[PDB]
């Protein structure tokens, strides 16, 4: 399957292959995302959850967040892909994490102005979201060369229940851009895996980036292809293009560039050297 990459790379036809996928992509209504009232709940006019797959906040007021549940049946893995929270939607965001029983949050964009800072910078400075009634405290953070992992405590003030959330932040990935190498990213991925944040025991991990489509789509596409190869009887059968289009049924626009598409291949290619 490496060869297929070799065929596109040598052809230098990557832009075309990305366009094929785009044409072949799903389309579904986005009636709620487009509601006049939800206008400021979306970071981008051009990026919206399909109505069928959108996550619903369970609190009475309004049930809308710009998030999509991606369900991959064969791989038995689920992802929530969402836009980087707006200053108004932080409360909503944390509510979705509580309600969906998520143990992990994967962030693939730098704060630089792509996304609000929705988590506590200091332990001493915990956050309260009065709209959704959630208190968030930063327990601990470990900073590394390529990424940061933080341990947070999200407490539902209503129920006085507590949950430990692990925050995984890839800090070296530029917007609309690709990391210099797949291994740094793959290492990031296994760290996320190792933590169990992707276990079926827990709710679907929340993955986000600025738009919640390109960087995030790469992370999810990569993990799934690699999962499939492990699970499957013949690993050679796994087709990235097939996998990407299945995900795009759940959320529009996953993987935004030809450059991202090439990277997913490289990452998946390098990733399965490891698994194998």
Curated annotation (Swiss-Prot):
Subcellular location as annotated: Endoplasmic reticulum membrane
Enzyme Commission identifier(s): 3.1.3.48
Modified residues (Cysteine persulfide): 209
Modified positions (Phosphoserine) in chain numbering: 48, 236-237
BP GO annotations: actin cytoskeleton organization; cellular response to angiotensin; cellular response to fibroblast growth factor stimulus; cellular response to hypoxia; cellular response to nerve growth factor stimulus; cellular response to nitric oxide; cellular response to platelet-derived growth factor stimulus; cellular response to unfolded protein
Keywords recorded for this protein, A-Z: Acetylation, Endoplasmic reticulum, Hydrolase, Membrane, Oxidation, Phosphoprotein, Protein phosphatase, S-nitrosylation
Domain Tyrosine-protein phosphatase: 1-271
Post-translational modification Phosphotyrosine, affected residues: 18, 64
Record PTM S-nitrosocysteine, positions in chain: 209
GO molecular function, one term: protein kinase binding
A single GO cellular-component term on record: early endosome
Tissue: Expressed in keratinocytes (at protein level).
UniProt entry tagged with the keyword Membrane: yes
Assembly behavior: Interacts with EPHA3 (phosphorylated); dephosphorylates EPHA3 and may regulate its trafficking and function. Interacts with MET. Interacts with NCK1.
Function recorded in the entry: Tyrosine-protein phosphatase which acts as a regulator of endoplasmic reticulum unfolded protein response. Mediates dephosphorylation of EIF2AK3/PERK; inactivating the protein kinase activity of EIF2AK3/PERK. May play an important role in CKII- and p60c-src-induced signal transduction cascades. May regulate the EFNA5-EPHA3 signaling pathway which modulates cell reorganization and cell-cell repulsion. May also regulate the hepatocyte growth factor receptor signaling pathway through dephosphorylation of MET.
The name this protein goes by in its record: Tyrosine-protein phosphatase non-receptor type 1
Full-protein residues shown: 3 to 282 of 435
């Amino acid at each position: 399957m490496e060869k297929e990459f070799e065929q596109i790379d040598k052809s230098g036809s990557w832009a075309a292959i990305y366009q094929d996928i785009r044409h072949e992509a799903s389309d579904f209504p986005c009636r709620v995302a487009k509601l006049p009232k939800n206008k400021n709940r979306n970071r981008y006019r051009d990026v919206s959850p399909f109505d069928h797959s959108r996550i619903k906040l369970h609190q009475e007021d309004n049930d809308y967040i710009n998030a999509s549940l991606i369900k991959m049946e064969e791989a038995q893995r689920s992802y929530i892909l969402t836009q980087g929270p707006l200053p108004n939607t932080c409360g909503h965001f944390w509510e979705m994490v509580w309600e969906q029983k998520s143990r992990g949050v994967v962030m693939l964009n730098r704060v630089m102005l792509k996304c609000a800072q929705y988590w506590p910078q200091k332990e001493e400075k915990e956050m309260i979201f009065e709209d959704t009634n959630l208190k968030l405290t930063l327990i601990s953070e470990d900073i590394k060369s390529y990424y940061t992992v933080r341990q947070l405590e999200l407490e539902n003030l209503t129920t006085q229940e507590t949950r430990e959330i692990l925050h995984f932040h890839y800090t070296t990935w530029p917007d609309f851009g690709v990391p210099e190498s797949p291994a740094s990213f793959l290492n990031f991925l296994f760290k996320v895996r190792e933590s169990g944040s992707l276990s079926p025991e827990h709710g679907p991990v929340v993955v986000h980036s600025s738009a919640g489509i390109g960087r995030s789509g790469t992370f999810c596409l990569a993990d799934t292809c690699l999962l499939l190869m492990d699970k499957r009887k013949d690993p050679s059968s796994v087709d990235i293009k097939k996998v990407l289009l299945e995900m795009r049924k759940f959320r529009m626009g996953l993987i935004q560039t030809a450059d991202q598409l090439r990277f997913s291949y490289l990452a998946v290619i390098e990733g399965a050297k490891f698994i194998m």
